[PDB]
């Protein structure tokens with residue numbers, strides 16, 4: 284389906300909320316939500332949120348000068364092929380809160396400063412009904 | 418018809434999201450969402466979100482020492498009788514962002530210090546499905 288890419292020219296502040304509503308295809312493998320620091324290829328990523336249906340896992344990480352940081356994995360997979368989903372990604376001064384459904388799924392401490400974030404990206408095996416930045 | 422009242426023993430910070438999902442009765446006059454700083458009757462209100470189906474308006478305000486403050490009004494009423502709704506109240510360093518539907522509605526700029534808030538209440542003419550604090 285069409286992916287999402289949107290600029291955040293001033294960055295984001297504690298209280299920024301990214302809301303993604305969609306539907307994991309019935310034969311999906313994996314999709315992702317990126318908060319990048321530029322339009323450049325493989326740019327630094329303050330957050331990489333990667334639900335993996337094929338391997339039954341959800342990986343969190345950051346990227347800096349082309350090398351990945353230490354992965355963090357959440358408890359379980361709050362996604363199912365063929366089911367719709369609602370994701371909130373909430374920026375605090377300490378980290379990102381990943382809310383799936385009606386419960387917080389994981390908390391990802393910042394590695395890159397918030398003010399360096401300048402681009403949001405949503406793609407993969409995912410059908411998107413709405414992407415909003417509040 | 419049941420009202421929601423839950424304590425925030427650790428308070429709220431920037432990056433906190435208050436999600437409310439419910440339905441407005443077909444005979445509703447008003448319902449309210451309050452962020453109070455204690456369980457006192459007539460406690461100080463850092464925020465008071467008051468949709469009104471009878472006078473067709475949405476009022477924001479703050480209470481301090483029993484006295485209401487300056488009233489702020491949103492553009493229109495994104496609520497209807499006999500219709501479901503979703504409301505996001507997002508706390509940041511500057512104020513509270515009120516989102517209704519899938520669109521930013523209004524921004525209430527802080528009056529009380531955010532650290533005062535220790536309690537959440539939802540009452541009035543409203544039928545609640547979920548009230549989550551992320």
Ligand SMILES: OC[C@H]1O[C@@H](O[C@H]2[C@H](O)[C@@H](O)[C@@H](O)O[C@@H]2CO)[C@H](O)[C@@H](O)[C@H]1O
Pocket residue numbers: 331333342343344351354
């Ligand atoms: O961490 C984000 C990236 O992970 C890469 O895959 C990891 C894999 O998760 C890990 O288990 C091991 O196999 O090494 C790989 C990288 O070192 C993904 O390929 C990449 O797309 C990101 O998701």
Ligand SMILES: OC[C@H]1O[C@@H](O[C@H]2[C@H](O)[C@@H](O)[C@@H](O)O[C@@H]2CO)[C@H](O)[C@@H](O)[C@H]1O
Pocket residue numbers: 465467476477478485488
């Ligand atoms: O909204 C704060 C309080 O307003 C009270 O009614 C106000 C009214 O909104 C205002 O237009 C003016 O006429 O003074 C009235 C009395 O303060 C509500 O009765 C109260 O519940 C609060 O909502």
